[PDB]
Design a protein around this nucleic acid. Structure first.
Lengths: 213, 289, 160, 52, 186, 122
RNA sequence: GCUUACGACCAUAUCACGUUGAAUGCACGCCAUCCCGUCCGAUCUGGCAAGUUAAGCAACGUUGAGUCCAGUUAGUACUUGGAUCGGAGACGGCCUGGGAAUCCUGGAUGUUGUAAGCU
RNA sequence: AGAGGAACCUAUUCUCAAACUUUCAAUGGAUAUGAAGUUGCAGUUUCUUUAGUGAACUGU
RNA sequence: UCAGAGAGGACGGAAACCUCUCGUAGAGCAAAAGGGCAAAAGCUUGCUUGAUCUUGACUUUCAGUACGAGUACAGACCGCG
């Protein structure tokens, strides 16, 4: 069976990503990372909520997927599949190791002790720090209550302490809502699907004319 | 198709040295040609640069420094009309004459011409200036640049001219004209004839016999200068004699006033004004289209 | 334990600088080195011959021999409780003139010139000693067009 | 009974106990390891210079 | 206003004498796909056609499907410059009936074709030699290409001085009264 | 600049400050000792000062005090002639001795409060 | 204001497109008997001077890319030394000194030596 | 993960590297800081240079 | 001048060979990994035996021992140019 999370909770070793040196790493449990109305236009979901961590620990792929499913079910049932866009902002890339030992009577005969104790891959965990964003979501201003309740329900699936906050930014973009609105009215921000691109000044006036800013 | 010369390519690009980009200096050979042994300290190492343009032959003497080479002497084929020749300033005879002029000129300048006269009788036999008295002969190492080293090349013609003038240029007769690569034999008579331009006169006669029109088309300005296939050898001999008689550089003229012939770079305000004008014009066209 | 090869752990030490590979510029060879001069050692990876050992990289030494294309240098090396003046034959490409000694020579030249000039002109011998920067002296500051600004700490703001 | 146990714990203290000895000042006077040709010429020059 | 003068100056520049398209070279190729008697006879054919000995090109790899081994001579090729090139090109275009496809011209300004049998090129058949097909490739370019090919200080030819597909097609049509067939059914 | 770095290096182990006239005079008169041939000799007379610093025109405790206070041209000789002062523990005690002066402790630069401390220590 | 030979620093010099180019010069260029080298006078080599600035090359243009410099980021990140400092811990702040780098913003677009020459 | 022209191209975007890096600290390492020095004059050399040209040494 | 890409050419195809553009090394350099290298250190080719004889000095490990390996010279006889 899987070892308790307390064994690999805290960050102690250097990063151990899957590479040519570490082979035979089992697939991580969490595969999906963007749920809800992911293909939404930038303006569909102006309100944004973050779920930050207050601990420097390891978030297992199992825990990440558990929180994902919990929040996704809550929002699908309370607000519809096409009313939100949830983004898991943390990917499990750190590999933990286990030094398996036999646990039957007489195991000491075949046990190797501490000689050559380098472990084998066990699972994929995501290294987290204080202030790191675990979950993010963009929704309509009339669904912030559901967003906060969903993040509340999900945080109990993670170890340690998490804090749910609402961001001043326009959805997942990098501009506060007021500046985003002003720049979009001006013509400096071009739709980039979920996000937007800044249209800088410099360059040939031939492309300038296509959108005079 | 994926774009190859993109932002990352230009970010990572490293430009070769200026002269390698210009395809004008071979640095691998330059390092070996110009670098002096560190236990000789700041003693100059002298290099005889030979170059052939489409219409001229350049022979120079130089030595290297941290801030650029120092050319100490020079001689050009276009400077031969003072010693005679008006045409054929690129052939073997002109190259040899330019080399001889350079050698005599620099020996005069450094005050060794009287001590070292070199070979004053054109015979085509290999000649190495032999040390006389205490002062050893001036020494220089040949620099051909990017020219191919073939037997009978005009670069080696210039080198032979300098060596005959009396500058110690280390060399072998292998790449002189008249040296047979197969039998490894040297024909001093053939080399002398090539130096004196007998090949040019032979071509003149051959074309004159073959076709008059082709002969004129080939030797137009030779005839205008009055050089025919029975006078060229004597002309080259006279040129050699005049070069050996006098080799001081020609005097310099006065500096004429100069006026701008090219456009001057716009200022910051001018560039911004042009930007504004183009913006206004483009907006006008967009509105009217 | 580690292997004891010559170039162990020199991956970045012996590498060229970014966008600086290729042909070696010729001022390196044109530079003049004389016995008694001080030179810094910085290995050039592009020249595998006459390389200094990794322990002498970035160290300054004094030339004691000048060969055709190399120099013998005396470099101090720490070995337990003694400093050994090791002798190494390094090629020119791995060598660079040291500027500390030339700066000191310039200072000595200036000192001698000032002393000679003052003595010839009859002036008193001037001060020729470097002094540590002394504490700032007394002065006055004017507030005209520079009125003091009252500063206070700022309140905490939740920056999401 | 593992007995490899390498360390560098007290070695700097031991080295500094008696002070770190810097190299002498006459090491720059010897001509050991200098070019043979230069040394030969120097010997010839020194052999011939007239004292007075 | 200024557009008229710009256009007329551009046309006057284009009408310069150094911009004339000319046949830089004609490359003949015969890939026999194997070595030995057949390759030697193909070399004989090419020598007869041009007048200069060809050069053998060897395989770069090994392919069991092609029955080709690495470093084995599999092709014979030649390059011809000048009036002989013009004559051989005229013979090839006669064989092709002065007809070519729009896709036979490269975007750089060269063009090629092939002949199935060299007997059609005005060469008497020889039972010992046989019949060989071959590849014609005409490389056109203006004067001054030496800038990109000389050893000392090479440069790059200017965009206006470069050749293009439609200019090569116009040259072909005007010189040989060539026909441009409709594109082959894809 | 050649001495301030040393003070920063030795910050945790020293209390230092800017002595005043009374502090300097009290130190020189109550606890003045001279290094004479390696011997700690109490300065009970101006002749002791004159014997060693007479070459530099310092002949009395007042001259020595002036040299120290104004950092004269012979500050080095004047001070090195003085044996390091061996002060008494302050009457009233210390405060923390493990925290800087600005932390409510004792070590570091206490500026002109060194005079207050020395009024007890001396 | 320029051209050439040889350079030094090796993009502020590179790359893309375009305009202009007086004089020297460079270059393209014509020919292939001879020297020389090729399947091929394409390259290399040799003899020349009808023609051209078309290209190379030089100067200039571009709210040009790159490169370089500066500001901002920011006294921020990080960090030396101190505490019988806070906290269960992870960590956090304070005292004492050092102190960056991206994004973004603005500007610059080769300098120069020896020799010869043009104007 | 979508956006603009199923893959493909373009400009973006989320998250990472003990055996990635343009850039790059704080602590840290080394060297130098005059008499065994600086200026000249006046000799030696078979080394070096076309060359008193240099290099080095010598001098109560 | 490489790896590779684009565009053309009888049989020829995704892949044989020929041609032109672009190509900062994305190839190759006997081998492991890492450095280094573009008129080269890579590819093609000509000629060669310096992979020879001789003694010292030095670096690396280090006790500043030895071996091994290497560095810069000096003397001889040679190779290429």
């Amino acid at each position: 069976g899987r070892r308790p999370a307390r064994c690999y909770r805290y960050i102690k070793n250097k990063p151990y990503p899957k590479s040519r040196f570490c082979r035979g790493v089992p697939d991580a449990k969490i595969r999906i990372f963007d749920l809800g109305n992911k293909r939404a236009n930038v303006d569909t979901f102006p309100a944004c909520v973050h779920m930050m961590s207050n601990e420097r620990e390891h978030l297992s792929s199992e825990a990440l997927e558990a929180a994902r499913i919990c929040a996704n079910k809550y929002m699908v049932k309370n607000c519809g599949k096409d009313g939100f866009h949830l983004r898991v902002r943390k990917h499990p890339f750190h590999v933990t190791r286990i030094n398996k030992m036999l646990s039957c009577a007489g195991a000491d005969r075949l046990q190797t002790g501490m000689r050559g104790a380098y472990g084998k891959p066990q699972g994929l965990v995501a290294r987290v720090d204080i202030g790191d964003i675990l979950f993010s979501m963009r929704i309509k201003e009339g669904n912030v209550k559901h967003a906060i309740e969903a993040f509340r329900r999900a945080k109990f699936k993670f170890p340690g302490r998490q804090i749910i906050v609402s961001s001043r930014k326009w959805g997942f973009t990098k501009w506060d809502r007021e500046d985003y609105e002003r720049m979009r009215a001006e013509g400096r921000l071009r739709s980039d699907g979920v996000g937007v691109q800044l249209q800088r000044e410099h360059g040939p006036l031939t492309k300038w004319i296509e959108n005079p800013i | 198709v994926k774009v190859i010369k993109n932002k990352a390519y230009f970010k990572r690009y490293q430009v070769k040295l200026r002269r390698r980009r210009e395809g004008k200096t071979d640095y691998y050979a330059r390092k070996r040609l110009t670098v002096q042994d560190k236990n000789k300290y700041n003693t100059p190492k002298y290099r005889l640069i030979v170059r052939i343009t489409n219409k001229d032959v350049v022979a120079q003497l130089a030595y290297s420094k941290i801030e650029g080479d120092v050319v100490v002497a020079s001689a050009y084929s276009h400077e031969l009309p003072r010693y005679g020749l008006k045409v054929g300033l690129t052939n073997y005879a002109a190259a040899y004459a330019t080399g001889l002029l350079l050698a005599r000129r620099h020996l005069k300048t450094i005050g060794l011409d009287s001590t070292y006269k070199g070979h004053e009788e054109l015979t085509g036999e290999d000649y190495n200036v032999e040390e006389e008295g205490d002062r050893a002969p001036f020494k220089a190492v040949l620099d051909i640049g990017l020219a191919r080293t073939t037997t009978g090349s005009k670069i080696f013609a210039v080198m032979k001219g300098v060596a005959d003038g009396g500058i110690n240029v280390p060399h072998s007769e292998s790449r002189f004209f008249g040296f047979d690569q197969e039998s490894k034999e040297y024909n001093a008579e053939a080399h002398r004839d090539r130096i004196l331009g007998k090949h040019v006169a032979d071509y003149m006669t051959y074309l004159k016999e073959e076709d008059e029109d082709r002969y004129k088309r080939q030797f137009s300005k030779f005839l205008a200068a009055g050089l025919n296939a029975d006078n060229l050898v004597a002309t080259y001999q006279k040129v050699h004699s005049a070069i050996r008689a006098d080799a001081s550089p020609a005097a310099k003229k006065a500096a004429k006033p100069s006026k701008r012939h090219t456009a001057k770079r716009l200022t910051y305000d001018e560039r911004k004004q042009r930007v504004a004008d183009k913006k206004a014009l483009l907006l006008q066209l967009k509105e009217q289209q | 334990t580690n292997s004891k090869g010559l170039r162990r752990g020199t991956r970045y030490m012996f590498a060229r600088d970014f966008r600086k590979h290729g042909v070696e510029h010729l001022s390196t060879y044109y530079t003049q080195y004389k016995r008694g001069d001080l030179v810094d050692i910085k290995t050039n990876g592009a020249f595998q011959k006459g390389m200094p050992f990794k322990a002498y990289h970035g160290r300054t030494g004094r030339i004691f021999n000048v060969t055709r294309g190399a120099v013998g240098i005396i470099v101090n090396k720490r070995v337990r409780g003694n400093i050994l003046p090791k002798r190494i034959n390094i090629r020119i490409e791995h060598i660079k003139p040291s500027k500390c000694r030339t700066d000191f020579l310039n200072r000595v030249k200036s000192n001698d010139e000032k002393r000679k000039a003052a003595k010839s002109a009859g002036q008193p011998v001037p001060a020729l000693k470097r002094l540590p920067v002394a504490p700032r002296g007394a002065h006055t500051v004017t507030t005209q067009n520079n009125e003091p600004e009252l500063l206070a700490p700022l309140r905490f703001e939740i920056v999401a | 009974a593992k007995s490899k146990n390498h360390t560098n714990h007290n070695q700097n203290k031991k080295a500094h106990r008696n002070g770190i000895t810097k190299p002498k000042k006459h090491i720059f006077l010897s001509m050991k390891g200098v070019d043979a040709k230069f040394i030969k010429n120097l010997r010839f020059s020194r052999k011939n210079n007239k004292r007075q | 206003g200024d557009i008229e003068k710009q256009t007329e100056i551009r046309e006057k520049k284009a009408r310069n004498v150094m911009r004339e398209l000319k046949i830089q070279k004609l490359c003949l190729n015969i890939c026999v796909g194997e070595s030995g008697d057949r390759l030697t006879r193909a070399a004989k054919v090419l020598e007869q056609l041009t007048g200069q000995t060809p050069v053998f090109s060897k395989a770069r790899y090994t392919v069991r499907t092609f029955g080709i081994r690495r470093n084995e001579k599999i092709a014979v090729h030649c390059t011809v410059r000048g009036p002989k090139a013009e004559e051989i090109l005229e013979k090839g275009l006669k064989v092709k009936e002065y007809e070519l496809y729009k896709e036979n011209f490269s975007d750089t300004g060269n063009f090629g074709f092939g002949v199935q049998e060299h007997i059609d090129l005005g060469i008497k058949y020889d039972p010992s030699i046989g019949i060989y097909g071959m590849d014609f490739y005409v490389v056109l370019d203006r004067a001054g290409r030496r800038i990109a090919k000389r050893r000392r200080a090479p440069g790059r030819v200017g965009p206006s001085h470069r050749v293009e597909r439609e200019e090569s097609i116009k040259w072909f049509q005007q010189k040989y009264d060539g026909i441009i067939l409709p594109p082959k059914p894809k | 600049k050649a001495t301030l770095p040393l003070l920063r290096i030795i910050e945790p182990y020293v209390a230092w400050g800017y002595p005043n006239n009374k502090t300097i005079h009290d130190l020189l008169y109550k606890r003045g000792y001279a290094k004479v041939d390696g011997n700690r000799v109490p300065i009970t007379d101006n002749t002791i000062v004159e014997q060693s610093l007479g070459k530099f025109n310092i002949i009395c405790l007042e001259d020595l005090a002036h040299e120290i206070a104004t950092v004269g041209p012979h500050f080095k000789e004047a001070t090195n002639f003085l044996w390091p002062f061996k002060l008494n523990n302050p009457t009233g005690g210390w405060t923390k001795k493990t925290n800087h002066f600005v932390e409510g402790g004792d070590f570091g630069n206490r500026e002109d409060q060194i005079n207050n401390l020395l009024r007890k220590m001396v």
